[PDB]
């Protein structure tokens, strides 16, 4: 994945998730994408209430993009693999 400052355009299914989180732009840095994804998970309360590094994304549009039912913030490879599939590097 590109570093810092590099601009990316999310594909439509990812952009729809970012829009729920309040994103109004079409072009982002990777860090900004991560900011909106964190906001989305928070707003939808997908994190496990007791073990808050675990995110339960089954039965949510985010799980359809990640292709996993749950993930750990400490093992974020599924998130970055999803971003590689869903970001156009500008």
């Amino acid at each position: 994945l590109p570093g810092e400052g590099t601009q990316v355009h999310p594909r439509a299914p990812l952009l729809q998730i970012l829009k729920v989180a309040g994103a109004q732009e079409e072009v982002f840095t990777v860090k900004e994408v991560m900011h909106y994804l964190g906001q989305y998970i928070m707003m939808k309360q997908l994190y496990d209430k007791q073990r808050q590094h675990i995110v339960h994304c089954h039965d949510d549009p985010l799980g359809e993009l990640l292709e996993v039912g749950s993930f750990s913030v400490k093992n974020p490879s599924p998130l970055y693999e999803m971003l590689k599939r869903n970001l156009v590097i500008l």
Binding site: H35, I41, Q52, H53
Partner: peptide, 14 residues
């Protein structure tokens, strides 16, 4: 006892 917000921020900023 760390919150999801703090854990995600740690990753985001790393």
């Amino acid at each position: 006892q760390e919150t999801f917000x703090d854990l995600w921020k740690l990753e985001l900023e790393n």
